[PDB]
Amino acid sequence: FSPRAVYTSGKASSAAGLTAAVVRDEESHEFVIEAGALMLADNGVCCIDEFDKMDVRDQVAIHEAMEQQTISITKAGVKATLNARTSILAAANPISGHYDRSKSLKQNINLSAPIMSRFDLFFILVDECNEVTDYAIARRIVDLHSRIEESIDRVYSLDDIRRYLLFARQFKPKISKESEDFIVEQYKHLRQRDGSGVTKSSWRI
DNA sequence: AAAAAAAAAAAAAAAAAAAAAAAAAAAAAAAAAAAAAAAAAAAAAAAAA
Numbered sequence A: 001f002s003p004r005a006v007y008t009s010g011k012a013s014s015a016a017g018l019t020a021a022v023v024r025d026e027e028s029h030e031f032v033i034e035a036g037a038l039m040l041a042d043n044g045v046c047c048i049d050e051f052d053k054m055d056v057r058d059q060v061a062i063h064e065a066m067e068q069q070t071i072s073i074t075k076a077g078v079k080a081t082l083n084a085r086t087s088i089l090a091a092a093n094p095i096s097g098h099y100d101r102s103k104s105l106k107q108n109i110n111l112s113a114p115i116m117s118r119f120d121l122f123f124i125l126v127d128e129c130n131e132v133t134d135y136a137i138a139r140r141i142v143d144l145h146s147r148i149e150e151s152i153d154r155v156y157s158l159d160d161i162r163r164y165l166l167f168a169r170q171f172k173p174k175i176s177k178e179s180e181d182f183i184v185e186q187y188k189h190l191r192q193r194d195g196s197g198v199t200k201s202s203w204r205i
Numbered sequence B: 001a002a003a004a005a006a007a008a009a010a011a012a013a014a015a016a017a018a019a020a021a022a023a024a025a026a027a028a029a030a031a032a033a034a035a036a037a038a039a040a041a042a043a044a045a046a047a048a049a
Helices: A056-068 A113-117 A131-146 A158-168 A177-193
Strands: A005-008 A020-024 A031-035 A045-048 A070-075 A078-083 A087-090
Touching: A020 A070, A020 A078, A031 A078, A056 A070, A056 A113
Parallel strands: A005 A045, A045 A087
Antiparallel strands: A020 A031, A070 A078
């Protein structure tokens, strides 16, 4: 869907191909910079599938881009600070493949704490063996495979949504005073979730 | 005991400057020789009893 979206996977990408590489200009005295995945996803989305399988030499580069939204490269005669304003959409498998609901999120995925701490939302998709949901998922899959071009009735075309999103990304909403107060109250409640007495949450607030 | 790691650690390929090596390269002027010609001195043969 997205323009400026790049899809990469776990152990198929090197650091240079994930962030930045330098090659010399064949015609002049300058250096031309090869954009990697996190540059081609600037103001877009980088989709890292199999995020748990990425090597630490590459996880550090993802982490640096997720920190300060840049890629500083010093290679082959040129240094340059590139720019990476990329959202990250990552998919990770749990340790041993199956998510263990009797453990914290840290005990379930081998992501480093620096990586995990700067993900806004974690979504746990546990396979619960529910016959009703099995029926519903099976029905939708079979309907997709029976009516290919139809069976999708989406109220807004993807081009419409792309235009709409390009437009709406130009808005910079303010936070009003009442929004400040409500944010503070919601944060207080969220932290109250983290207290003792009540059961453990999968990860701290 | 094997299963991921996580380095050496070797190769091929690249760069990447050095620092050395390699490759390009006729025409203009002169002089000497040999030949001429020219001013001067010198050496010939016609004059007469």
